[PDB]
Paper text:
M pro is able to process polyproteins to produce several nonstructural proteins (NSPs) necessary for viral replication. The recognition site of coronaviral M pro depends on Gln at the P1 position, and no proteases in humans share a similar cleavage site. PF-00835231 is an inhibitor designed for the main protease of SARS-CoV that emerged in 2003, but its clinical trials were suspended due to the rapid disappearance of the SARS outbreak.
We then used the co-crystallization method to determine the crystal structures of several M pro mutants of SARS-CoV-2 in complex with PF-00835231. The resolutions for these structures are 1.79 Å (M pro G15S with PF-00835231)A, 1.68 Å (M pro K90R with PF-00835231), 1.65 Å (M pro M49I with PF-00835231), 1.72 Å (M pro P132H with PF-00835231), 1.64 Å (M pro S46F with PF-00835231), 1.66 Å (M pro V186F with PF-00835231) and 1.91 Å (M pro Y54C with PF-00835231), respectively. The details of the interaction between M pro V186F and PF-00835231 show that PF-00835231 interacts with several residues, including His41, Phe140, Cys145, His163, His164, Glu166, and Gln189. The results clearly showed that the ligand binding patterns are not disrupted by these mutations. The IC 50 value of PF-00835231 against SARS-CoV-2 M pro was 0.0086 μM, while the IC 50 value of PF-00835231 against SARS-CoV-2 M pro mutants, including K90R, M49I, G15S, V186F, P132H and Y54C, ranged from 1.2 to 3.7 μM.
Residue numbers in the entry:
A (entry chain B): 2 to 300
B (entry chain A): 3 to 300
């Protein structure tokens, strides 16, 4: 079996709180004695239309912020702003703070999302940072401040804080230093994303996952050069495949005994011939949201 | 719409490892009892055709190694209930959530927390197929991993993992140790019955499409439940039960499309095909989203 698998979310759930300023409420992330949340919590609905954030934040006091961890109210004893993230200092340390790091992920990398509402975790699922710096998430009203993360030997690497749903239904957010992924900004305005492309290295990793799980129907006897593959890939709005990608796919090629460029010839055939109503690992579409690491970790 | 698992933290705090001899798997620690698959008592040779009652005779409390991480929990009693072992331990788990044990029906979904050596590794949604298998993702050492739903902070445990079939799907028990489907906990190649499509979930999917403005497939016809069930079975679809009709109630009321009107719409999709059209951006009808899943994502 091969499934989209998220990291266990317990270490993050114990950090989710509710942050309220006036009539505006969203989720916050509580690590040690700091609560991180989207800065537009300070805005009224009219402010979000065209906010001058530094001007609005100087007009706020500590007592303007209501932070709730479960039923407990944590007193704000300080506040600062880092790009699009608000940092609320509280008088209580979160006893459940995990070992953690803040990281900015690269396009094509995956992370688990813990969707939260009113400070309470609701569901967990896997997302990839798209090449156009959106993510195809599942987020409703009140999900802002939900975070994305990876977990490596008990250490949580936070990489995403949720801010926005674009008109097309995809999602946009920041790293935990408050810098958006993509050309987006935190204003109540309709924003279009750049043209998205398909994460080629992930499609290849996923075809390897299919072979590891006993499916080989898409393979062929042909091969290709790296450049000839990249010409066809770009024609189909796939990202270029680099030699670093070829190397990263090494273990999966070694595990299956299928040279990377042999697998590229397979994908090239799938792109030019379609799948003709057949299916790969249950999907009628070429899946690009598993990294080579996601495949290795699960297989 | 996407497969969304429940947050797993309340279950992570219950996972332990259980070793007997050199055989290690996962267990579930609730209050002062640890639940785990009974084949932990088997030697690899014993798994081929085990007599569990005779095997358990030769076992005492002191043969069982229960560890939360590396911390041993002393076993003070043991008993077998169907295919699960219940180990009484001397410590009540302080992380025990409000919980119950439930036996689910085919078509219901649940989250699986995949674990190895008592350590949670990942979480994903599964659906119980009509042939009582799940399309899981399980490696060696995963037995004892559990499936669950969370409703208002109460965790309903429904699945404990035991087996991978030759076809690569998975089989297990409820938390009273009764297998889902015609399977046995022995080292033998077992086949499941032919599977079918989960009709009630396809209907839930069509409701989700209507909710989102995608309703070209709505027809001008209706059907009786009996007539629909007879036609569905000729397309390898599950027949609907009265319980299925009632769990579609909220979606029916929300859209104003009667359940039997949606059945007639599905009946036309089965007999005439989609004619190269899509529903929620897909040529295939999805059968792994329950009416509850649709409500929770919409
Ligand atoms: C937050 O929870 C805000 O606290 C909210 C999350 C989205 C709501 C629906 N789905 C979500 O993921 N985010 C927003 O509401 C943001 C707020 C900004 C950053 C100040 N705004 C949008 O996502 C937004 C605004 C508009 C829009 O206007 C006009 C027009 C079209 C799309 C759109 N998205
Ligand atoms: C547990 O980890 C075991 O404690 C393991 C989990 C599977 C291993 C690979 N993926 C899994 O989900 N379970 C087993 O190995 C069980 C043990 C039984 C219940 C005693 N056995 C099988 O899953 C099994 C045995 C055989 C078989 O024999 C011969 C032939 C074909 C398939 C098969 N599966």
């Amino acid at each position: 079996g091969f499934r989209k698998m998220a990291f266990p979310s317990g270490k993050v759930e114990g950090c989710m709180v509710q942050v309220t300023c006036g009539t505006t409420t969203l989720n916050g992330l509580w690590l040690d004695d700091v609560v991180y949340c989207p800065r537009h919590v300070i805005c009224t609905s009219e402010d979000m239309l065209n906010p001058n954030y530094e001007d609005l934040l100087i007009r706020k006091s500590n007592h303007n912020f209501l932070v709730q961890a479960g039923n407990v109210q944590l007193r704000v004893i300080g506040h600062s702003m880092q790009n699009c993230v608000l940092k609320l200092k509280v008088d209580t340390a979160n006893p459940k703070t995990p070992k953690y790091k803040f990281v900015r992920i690269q396009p094509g990398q995956t992370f688990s999302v813990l969707a939260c509402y009113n400070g309470s975790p609701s569901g967990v699922y896997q997302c990839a940072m798209r090449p156009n710096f959106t993510i195809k998430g599942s987020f409703l009203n009140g999900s802002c401040g939900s975070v994305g993360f990876n977990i490596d030997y008990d250490c949580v690497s936070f990489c995403y804080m949720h801010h926005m749903e674009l008109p097309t239904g995809v999602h946009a957010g920041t790293d935990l230093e408050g810098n958006f992924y993509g050309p987006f900004f935190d204003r109540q305005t309709a924003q279009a994303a750049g043209t998205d492309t398909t994460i080629t290295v992930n499609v290849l990793a996923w075809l390897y996952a299919a072979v590891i799980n006993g499916d080989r129907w898409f393979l062929n006897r042909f091969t290709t050069t790296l450049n000839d593959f990249n010409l066809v890939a770009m024609k189909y709005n796939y990202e270029p495949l680099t030699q670093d990608h070829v190397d990263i796919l090494g273990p999966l090629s070694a595990q299956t005994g299928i040279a990377v460029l042999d697998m590229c010839a397979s994908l090239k055939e799938l792109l030019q011939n379609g799948m003709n109503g057949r299916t790969i690992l249950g999907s009628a579409l070429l899946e690009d949201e598993f990294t080579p690491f996601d495949v290795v970790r699960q297989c």
